[PDB]
Amino acid sequence: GLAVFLPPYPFRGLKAPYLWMFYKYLHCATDSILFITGEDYLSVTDDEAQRARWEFDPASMASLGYELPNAQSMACHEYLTLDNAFYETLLSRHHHDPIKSFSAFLTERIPDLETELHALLDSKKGIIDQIDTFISICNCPSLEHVARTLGKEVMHIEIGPLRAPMYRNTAYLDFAGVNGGTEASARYEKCQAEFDIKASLGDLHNYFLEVLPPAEAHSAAGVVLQVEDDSNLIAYNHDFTNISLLSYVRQRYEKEDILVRAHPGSLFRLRDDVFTIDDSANSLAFINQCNEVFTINSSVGLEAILTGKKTTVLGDCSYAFINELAGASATVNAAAFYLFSYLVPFDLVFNQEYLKFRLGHPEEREIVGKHIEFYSADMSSLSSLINEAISLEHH
Amino acid sequence: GLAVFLPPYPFRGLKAPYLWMFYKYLHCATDSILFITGEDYLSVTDDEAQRARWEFDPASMASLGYELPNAQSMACHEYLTLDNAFYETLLSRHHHDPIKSFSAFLTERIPDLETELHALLDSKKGIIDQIDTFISICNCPSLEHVARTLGKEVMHIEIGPLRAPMYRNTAYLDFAGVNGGTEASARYEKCQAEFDIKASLGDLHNYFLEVLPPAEAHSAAGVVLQVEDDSNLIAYNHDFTNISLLSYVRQRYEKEDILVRAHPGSLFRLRDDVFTIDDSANSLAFINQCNEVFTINSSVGLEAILTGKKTTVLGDCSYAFINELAGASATVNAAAFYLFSYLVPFDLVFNQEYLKFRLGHPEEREIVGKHIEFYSADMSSLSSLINEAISLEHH
Numbered sequence: 001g002l003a004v005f006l007p008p009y010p011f012r013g014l015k016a017p018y019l020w021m022f023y024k025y026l027h028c029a030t031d032s033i034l035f036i037t038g039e040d041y042l043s044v045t046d047d048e049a050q051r052a053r054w055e056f057d058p059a060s061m062a063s064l065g066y067e068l069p070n071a072q073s074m075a076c077h078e079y080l081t082l083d084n085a086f087y088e089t090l091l092s093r094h095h096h097d098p099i100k101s102f103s104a105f106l107t108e109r110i111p112d113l114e115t116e117l118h119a120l121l122d123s124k125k126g127i128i129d130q131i132d133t134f135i136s137i138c139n140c141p142s143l144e145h146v147a148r149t150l151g152k153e154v155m156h157i158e159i160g161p162l163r164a165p166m167y168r169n170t171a172y173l174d175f176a177g178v179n180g181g182t183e184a185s186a187r188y189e190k191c192q193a194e195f196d197i198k199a200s201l202g203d204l205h206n207y208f209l210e211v212l213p214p215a216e217a218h219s220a221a222g223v224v225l226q227v228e229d230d231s232n233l234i235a236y237n238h239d240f241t242n243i244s245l246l247s248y249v250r251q252r253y254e255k256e257d258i259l260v261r262a263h264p265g266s267l268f269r270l271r272d273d274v275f276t277i278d279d280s281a282n283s284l285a286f287i288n289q290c291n292e293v294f295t296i297n298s299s300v301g302l303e304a305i306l307t308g309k310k311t312t313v314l315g316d317c318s319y320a321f322i323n324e325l326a327g328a329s330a331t332v333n334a335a336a337f338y339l340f341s342y343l344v345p346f347d348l349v350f351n352q353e354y355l356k357f358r359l360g361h362p363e364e365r366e367i368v369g370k371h372i373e374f375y376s377a378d379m380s381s382l383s384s385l386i387n388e389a390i391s392l393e394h395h
Numbered sequence: 396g397l398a399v400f401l402p403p404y405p406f407r408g409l410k411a412p413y414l415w416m417f418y419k420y421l422h423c424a425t426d427s428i429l430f431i432t433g434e435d436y437l438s439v440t441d442d443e444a445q446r447a448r449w450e451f452d453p454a455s456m457a458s459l460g461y462e463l464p465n466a467q468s469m470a471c472h473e474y475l476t477l478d479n480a481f482y483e484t485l486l487s488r489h490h491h492d493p494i495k496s497f498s499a500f501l502t503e504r505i506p507d508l509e510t511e512l513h514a515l516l517d518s519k520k521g522i523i524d525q526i527d528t529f530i531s532i533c534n535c536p537s538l539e540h541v542a543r544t545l546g547k548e549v550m551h552i553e554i555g556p557l558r559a560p561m562y563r564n565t566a567y568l569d570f571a572g573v574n575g576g577t578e579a580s581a582r583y584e585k586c587q588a589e590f591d592i593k594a595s596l597g598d599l600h601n602y603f604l605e606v607l608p609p610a611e612a613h614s615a616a617g618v619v620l621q622v623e624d625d626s627n628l629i630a631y632n633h634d635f636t637n638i639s640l641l642s643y644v645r646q647r648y649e650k651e652d653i654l655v656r657a658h659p660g661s662l663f664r665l666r667d668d669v670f671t672i673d674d675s676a677n678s679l680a681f682i683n684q685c686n687e688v689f690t691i692n693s694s695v696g697l698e699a700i701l702t703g704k705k706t707t708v709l710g711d712c713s714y715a716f717i718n719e720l721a722g723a724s725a726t727v728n729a730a731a732f733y734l735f736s737y738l739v740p741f742d743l744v745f746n747q748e749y750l751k752f753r754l755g756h757p758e759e760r761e762i763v764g765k766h767i768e769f770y771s772a773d774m775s776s777l778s779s780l781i782n783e784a785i786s787l788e789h790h
């Protein structure tokens with residue numbers, strides 16, 4: 001079965017931080033799952049003091065495709081709960097900086113957490129044998145060390161950079177790292193010579209578009225801001241922040257030529273009069289107003305690259321290698337590989353059979369074939385598969 | 396004469412960043428000054444592309460007490476200008492992160508900058524002999540190393556934590572460091588036994604108040620936010636940011652009990668619905684609504700301490716040592732020493748005679764006497780001097 005790691009540590013100030021993925025795995029479960037999580041994930045549903053969070057919003061349940069679980073649903077799974085007291089110990093070991101504690105969680109081993117993971121997995125005979133893989137929503141060297149000792153793989157799984165409603169929902173599935181330390185570039189490198197994609201970047205973008213474009217845009221410099229305590233801005237950012245990203249652009253452009261777009265999930269917005277503030281209904285309308293795009297490691301950086309905009313990417317992320325190729329032809333091929341083979345149809349990362357498939361580490365051809373089958377469920381070599389999928393969308 | 400260091404490096408995206416202090420020294424000059432600055436400080440006045448900045452606002456000129464300079468004014472001083480090309484070199488040595496370059500400027504030696512400072516000071520015979528002290532608006536180990544080689548002191552001088560209109564204007568004057576690495580605590584330690592202040596913290600606060608209080612406030616937890624690229628949040632912050640400060644408070648309080656106040660000089664404000672946002676006309680009205688106050692190293696932390704609020708100070712700053720004393724009596728004495736001896740009447744740090752005075756390193760008694768003379772210009776031991784000054788305000 002699956003061992004899904006959903007840590008309860010409230011680094012950013014919210015209990016059950018990964019509640020949406022908990023709900024999605026529960027909803028899609030074909031088999032009994034092993035959850036390694038916190039007490040808070042089980043009780044949050046009967047806690048009216050936070051019934052207003054976004055995971056209970058019907059639009060959120062519709063866009064992500066889950067239902068709130070019930071006793072029947074939950075009852076057929078096993079739960080290992082981490083203890084809240086080690087959290088306070090960890091905070092006190094980092095000057096009580098919860099965000100610096102997050103960073104350490106994401107990027108360093110925590111021997112005490114290893115030891116508690118080992119005891120939880122040991123607490124019931126047979127648990128370890130039934131584990132076919134770990135699944136983790138974030139990098140976590142504590143868990144990766146435990147997994148090595150036990151001979152288990154760790155799938156790092158997250159929502160992807162293309163998301164509804166603008167796009168088909170995508171997910172990350174990476175055996176090395178999600179967002180930071182990813183294997184997307186290394187998987188492409190072993191395939192770069194087995195590529196001949198007869199489509200432009202626009203076509204790749206069009207394939208995932210679920211909406212009509214805004215179209216027909218100007219502002220020399222677009223600045224993408226991110227959520228300030230996103231793991232992306234905590235560990236994978238090369239020390240850049242929204243404020244230093246903004247200064248970086250001002251080293252290059254006069255204020256009149258800068259268009260700034262705050263992240264809609266952020267607790268902060270821009271002061272209304274100093275730079276021009278973007279008011280677009282979506283990040284695609286925002287980048288269409290822009291000649292150049294500047295980001296640390298936002299999902300929007302990928303959007304800009306696919307629509308052909310000169311993009312500056314200051315942080316580490318899964319898609320950066322596409323931007324670092326020099327040839328236009330290589331850039332198209334890399335983007336196609338990223339979109340059709342690295343990225344996963346969102347629902348499939350919660351599908352047990354699909355996960356078993358990937359655990360066998362099959363050929364790139366097979367992975368692309370499975371993804372296109374999903375994408376096409378209502379409408380050969382690797383190149384041949386993607387060219388036909390695109391062609392079928394064309395008419 | 397004075398050698399005033401006003402670096403031109405636009406780390407935060409503005410040319411002539413320290414233009415206000417340039418104007419204030421020019422306005423108050425009784426003698427010819429040596430300015431070590433950038434070309435931009437001289438030409439900014441004839442540049443209409445930024446006539447809208449705050450240093451040209453009449454309210455700003457009135458509150459700080461300077462006039463815009465003219466040819467006569469400027470003409471009797473000497474100017475050493477730093478070259479813009481080393482700036483680009485420095486940025487490229489820090490991954491083109493302007494804020495990380497700022498940090499390095501504030502906290503590490505830059506041999507190439509030492510070498511250029513040495514050449515500028517050498518470029519005209521006699522310059523070095525006429526230097527009685529350096530004045531710097533920020534810590535700068537490049538300049539401190541040069542100063543040691545030449546046998547010159549470095550006065551670190553800044554606007555203080557109490558400012559008009561709420562307060563009499565104050566300034567910092569510190570031979571070791573301003574904001575970070577300060578000597579306020581060490582100066583108090585040599586005097587702690589020569590103290591007997593017969594006033595409360597409220598009286599000390601009242602002495603500097605220039606306004607009627609808002610009065611009569613509740614919200615358990617006040618969170619003071621700062622400007623995101625303030626040197627205080629770049630180098631002296633112990634890695635804390637507004638976002639991690641906010642999370643720190645959420646580890647301790649429910650969202651309902653949190654009152655957040657954004658800095659009015661910030662480019663960012665808070666999202667309108669998640670925490671309660673302070674709308675006070677001034678930081679004093681904001682902290683009066685609060686049972687506890689949380690800051691990294693804002694000037695407001697001092698305000699909270701003087702009004703008796705439980706204050707948490709997560710970063711380094713000049714006033715923190717006051718908060719770390721355990722006795723109420725010691726806390727009062729430390730605050731009195733800080734306010735009357737460490738802090739300086741704003742105008743005096745631009746007064747050449749006063750600076751010559753401090754360069755002689757006189758007794759704490761003498762420093763307090765001079766400050767009270769200034770404060771009293773229109774109305775003994777060290778304790779005796781402050782008790783009488785307070786008493787005279789009383790009636």
Ligand SMILES: CC(=O)N[C@@H]1[C@@H](O[C@@H]2O[C@@H](C)[C@H](O)[C@@H](O)[C@H]2O)[C@H](O)[C@@H](CO)O[C@H]1O
Nearest residue numbers: 062063064065066164168169170345346347
């Ligand atoms: C209406 C629709 O198709 N919505 C998408 C979700 O699909 C629905 O919910 C899942 C649970 C079913 O398996 C599908 O057959 C479908 O009925 C989907 O889960 C999410 C994620 O891609 O996207 C919605 O748009």
Ligand SMILES: CC(=O)N[C@@H]1[C@@H](O[C@@H]2O[C@@H](C)[C@H](O)[C@@H](O)[C@H]2O)[C@H](O)[C@@H](CO)O[C@H]1O
Nearest residue numbers: 017018020054064158159227231264265266
């Ligand atoms: C499904 C989704 O994208 N949700 C968004 C949130 O991101 C998810 O939840 C947090 C807990 C994780 O750290 C993210 O990595 C991701 O898995 C996001 O935090 C909020 C606010 O921007 O918006 C949701 O839509």
Ligand SMILES: CC(=O)N[C@@H]1[C@@H](O[C@@H]2O[C@@H](C)[C@H](O)[C@@H](O)[C@H]2O)[C@H](O)[C@@H](CO)O[C@H]1O
Nearest residue numbers: 457458459460461559563564565740741742
């Ligand atoms: C009106 C007033 O006193 N304003 C204060 C400033 O003082 C004035 O300007 C200076 C240049 C003169 O030397 C003073 O005699 C006075 O006329 C003062 O400079 C600033 C700073 O403390 O504060 C104003 O409130």
Ligand SMILES: CC(=O)N[C@@H]1[C@@H](O[C@@H]2O[C@@H](C)[C@H](O)[C@@H](O)[C@H]2O)[C@H](O)[C@@H](CO)O[C@H]1O
Nearest residue numbers: 412413415449459553554622626659660661
């Ligand atoms: C005189 C004053 O307090 N001005 C405020 C600005 O601070 C000063 O200017 C910058 C360039 C320095 O880095 C500060 O250390 C200080 O000397 C401040 O930046 C702006 C915005 O908050 O507000 C002015 O009033």
Ligand SMILES: Nc1ccn([C@@H]2O[C@H](COP(=O)(O)O)[C@@H](O)[C@H]2O)c(=O)n1
Nearest residue numbers: 224225226261262263264283298299300
């Ligand atoms: N400045 C920003 C950043 C993100 N976004 C939206 O948020 C989603 C996730 O972006 P991040 O990866 O930047 O969190 C993007 O696909 C885009 O829809 C936005 O609309 N404006």
Ligand SMILES: Nc1ccn([C@@H]2O[C@H](COP(=O)(O)O)[C@@H](O)[C@H]2O)c(=O)n1
Nearest residue numbers: 619620621656657658659678693694695
């Ligand atoms: N959150 C904040 C921070 C500062 N301030 C004001 O800004 C001035 C300087 O504060 P900092 O030292 O925090 O920059 C303070 O004296 C106070 O008047 C405010 O009004 N609200």
Ligand SMILES: COc1ccc(C(=O)NCCCCCCCCO)cc1
Nearest residue numbers: 250251252405408409410479482483
């Ligand atoms: C306040 O406005 C300003 C702000 C900064 C400058 C300034 O010195 N630029 C020089 C370096 C610019 C970096 C370009 C690197 C190119 C590789 O990408 C001028 C004016």
Ligand SMILES: COc1ccc(C(=O)NCCCCCCCCO)cc1
Nearest residue numbers: 010013014015084087088645646647
């Ligand atoms: C989402 O709400 C939350 C957020 C965090 C917690 C939580 O685990 N607190 C435990 C540590 C709190 C730190 C106090 C240290 C005391 C020294 O100052 C609970 C609920």
Ligand code: NA
Nearest residue numbers: 206207208209
């Ligand atoms: Na499409």
Ligand code: NA
Nearest residue numbers: 322323325331
């Ligand atoms: Na490229």
Ligand code: NA
Nearest residue numbers: 601602603604
């Ligand atoms: Na007063």
Ligand code: NA
Nearest residue numbers: 717718720726
């Ligand atoms: Na104290």
